[PDB]
Amino acid sequence: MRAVNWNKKEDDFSLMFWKQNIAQFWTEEEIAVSSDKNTWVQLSKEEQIAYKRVLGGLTLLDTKQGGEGMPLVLVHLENLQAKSVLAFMGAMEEVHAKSYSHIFTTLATEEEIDEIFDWVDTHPLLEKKAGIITSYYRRLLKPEVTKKELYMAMVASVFLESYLFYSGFFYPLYLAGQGKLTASGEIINLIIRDESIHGVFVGILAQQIFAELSAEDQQEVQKETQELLMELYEIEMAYTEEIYTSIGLVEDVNRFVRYNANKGLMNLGLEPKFEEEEINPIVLNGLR
Amino acid sequence: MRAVNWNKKEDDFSLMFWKQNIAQFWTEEEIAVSSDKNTWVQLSKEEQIAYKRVLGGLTLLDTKQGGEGMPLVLVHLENLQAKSVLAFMGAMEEVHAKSYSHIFTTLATEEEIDEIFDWVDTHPLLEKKAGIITSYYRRLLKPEVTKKELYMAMVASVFLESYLFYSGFFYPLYLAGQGKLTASGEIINLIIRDESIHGVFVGILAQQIFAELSAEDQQEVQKETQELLMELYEIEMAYTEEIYTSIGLVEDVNRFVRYNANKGLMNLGLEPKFEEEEINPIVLNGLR
Ligand SMILES: [Mn+2]
Ligand SMILES: [Mn+2]
Ligand SMILES: [Mn+2]
Ligand SMILES: [Mn+2]
């Protein structure tokens, strides 16, 4: 049985991603968010509710990526160096999820927080979207998997990392780009820096598997991929309508969702499916 | 679907272990080991071979714990806070595994390193012991697991964490306690500090599951755990004879194995099975 041997490279990229994960390491104790209270209380009731709801959704996606998406993909890799990278990325999703709790503690009472998590658990669109992604992961709960199954779990993972988070990341960035909730915005920026490398790395692993599939299997997963993209898009459009109508931002968020969907396709080596539009300028300032 | 909510504790211990994992965070870049070359060359060929072989075995065990033991147990754990802790522990196993490669780079040529990893992969006792442990993990590759299956995976995990590593950790500690290979010894001591908390934590989780089992299931797993302890012990005694007879340390290592087996049992809430014997004084100095 093989031990991981970093003296003999298994690919040309795992070492660089391993080092970059670690170079980017952080935890929530590094960013105090109490100073956000001054701008939090200036938000309207509707703005505050939207913020808490999107944070709840982000927490769900990180919970499932750390607890299903990374572990179940990694188990089925033959490349022990790439497995190492995914184990660390999965741990970072748990750091991310805990950081949302750290933000919540400043922004809400204990009772308000538990309300948000009950709203998350019972939310039908969050249940639907998480169910779609995790179905690909849970297919891997068996000793022998096909390359089509593993590839599609990697596609679902890239779509979570590079696409499904972004209807939520929009609002912390949009507020921070205006000088509101800037400390929480700094945390979200650290999370995004991690998710961006996660999506690139899993997309590299997916492209490697794709190249090994027969032409017939390639056709089949290309179809599944394009269908999954649009199945998720329909849910995302319903989610943005629900969250952002009250604050007048639906079309701006939708534009941001499409921009990030294109990035996820690119991470898989695929052509964009939505027209190119420039990112919202305030969001761009929030990333700065 | 539920998101992890650290504002509502799921148990009385996961937060403390989460914080301690992180407090103990380290990577190999932090300890240069080039200065160990001066004492490395003082060793005989037999001492050097033993050292490289035991590090190879340690690397194998950490590879399997990061790539199978932590991910498959955590996937099936219901408690989302404890799941978070296990994800971090699994990532640390990959840090540990990579740190062995860092030691190897100082102590051996590229060709010698690849020969050690071939010796690991073909080794019959390493294959047997790793296969015994991973057979319990691989039983968890199914959509839903029984509590007996999950408990036995946690037992196997504690036995790896608290027991199987120690026939290997002996030698770096013994040499470091004589002032030899002290930089590598410092790394091993950081690894041990992590494995000790890993074994305590998984043992807490195991005791919780055990107490939820029916009486008939408890009787079954109690017997299986005692058999497993002694099945592994027979293999360990063959391993120590093979590795350490050339350098006269077999009985010393065996005493250390029994000492650590007792600690594994205690981590599971079980009584010691081996006579108490005081720790070797040189090893004790290497831990200091
Ligand atoms: Mn994340
Ligand atoms: Mn991620
Ligand atoms: Mn370890
Ligand atoms: Mn461990």
Cβ pair A148, A221 in contact under 8 A: yes
Closest partner residue to A60 among B3, B120, B142, by Cβ? B3
A248: left (phi over 0), alpha (psi -120 to 50) or beta: left
Measure in Å the smallest separation between the Cα of B27 and chain A Cα atoms.
Answer: 8
Closest CA–CA distance from residue B281 to any residue of chain A (Å): 31
Considering CB atoms only, which of A60, A130, A143 is closest to B138? A143
What is the distance between the alpha carbons of residues A87 and B190, in angstroms, rounded to a whole number?
19
Token reading at B266:
């205690």
Residues in binding site of B for Fe(3+):
62, 93, 96, 161, 195, 198
Q: How many beta carbons lie within 10 A of that of residue B186, not counting itself?
A: 16
Structure resolution in Å?
Answer: 1.3
Beta carbons within 8 Å of A272's beta carbon, 6+ residues apart: A262, A265, A266
Q: What determination technique applies here? A: X-ray
Task: Give the CA count within 13 Å in the CB-facing half-sphere of B220.
Answer: 10
Are A13 and A20 within 8 A, CB to CB?
Answer: no
Place of tokens 């750290």: A102
* Mutation target among B77, B84, B116, B194 for the A interface, most CBs of A within 10 A: B84
- The three-state secondary structure class of B6 is coil
Burial of A137 (0-12, 13-18, 19+ CB in 10 A): buried
**Contact yes or no for B89/B201 (Cβ under 8 A):** yes
User: What is d(CA B146, CA B152) in angstroms, rounded to the nearest whole number?
Assistant: 10
Q: What is the largest CA-CA distance in chain A?
A: 60
CB A29 within 8 A of CB A202: no
Q: Binding-site residues of A for Fe(2+), please?
A: 62, 93, 96, 161, 195, 198
Binding-site residue positions of B: 62, 93, 96, 161, 195, 198
DSSP A91-138: HHHHHHHHHHHHHHHHHS-HHHHHHHHHHHHH-HHHHHHHHHHHHHHH
H or E element that contains B45? helix B45-64
The enclosing domain of A33 has a CATH number of 1.10.620.20
Q: How many folded domains does chain B comprise?
A: 1
- Could you give the C-alpha distances from A230 to A133, A149, A172, B243, in angstroms and in order? 13, 19, 25, 58
Rounded distance between C-alpha atoms, residue A218 and residue A268, angstroms: 13
Tell how far the Cα of A254 is from the centroid of ligand 4, in angstroms. 44
Cβ-contact B206, B268 below 8 angstroms: yes
What span, in angstroms and rounded, lies between the C-alpha atoms of B119 and B112? 10
Full residue range of the structural domain in which residue B150 is found = 1-288
Q: Count CA within 13 A, CB hemisphere, residue A171.
A: 24
Q: What is the DSSP letter of A279?
A: P
Residues of A in contact with B142 (CB under 8 A): 141-142
Residues of A involved in catalysis? 100
For residue A4, the 8-state DSSP code is: P
Residue B76 in contact with residue B150, Cβ under 8 Å? yes
How far is ligand 1, taken at its centre, from the CA of residue A180, in Å? 22
Question: What spatial distance separates the first Cα and last Cα of chain B, rounded to whole Å?
Answer: 47
**Nearest-10 crossing angle of helices A250-267, A166-176:** 120
The Å distance, Cα A122 to ligand 2 centre, comes to 24
User: Within 13 Å and on the Cβ side, how many CA atoms surround A76?
Assistant: 27
Of A70, A94, A130, nearest to B1 by CB-CB distance is A130
Give the residue from chain B lying closest to A83, CA to CA: B67
Tell me which chain B residues have a C-beta less than 8 angstroms from the C-beta of A141. 75, 141-143
Least CA distance to A99: which residue of chain B?
B6
Say whether B67 and A80 touch across the interface (CB within 8 A): yes
Out of A71, A138, A143, closest to residue B71 by CB? A71
Smallest Cα distance from A172 to chain B, Å: 19
Q: Best mutation site among B8, B64, B75 for testing chain A: the one with the most A CBs within 10 Å?
A: B75
Kindly determine whether residue A25 and residue B25, on different chains, have CB atoms separated by under 8 Å.
yes
Find the radius of gyration of the CA atoms of chain B. Answer: 19
Q: What is the DSSP letter of B67?
A: I
Q: Which residues contact A22 (CB under 8 A, 6 or more apart)?
A: A88, B27, B29
CA distance B17 to A117: 23
- Is the CB of residue A184 less than 8 Å from the CB of residue A33? yes
Q: How many CB pairs under 8 A join A and B?
A: 170
Tokens of A224: 């599944």
Give distance in angstroms: CA of A100 to centre of ligand 2.
14
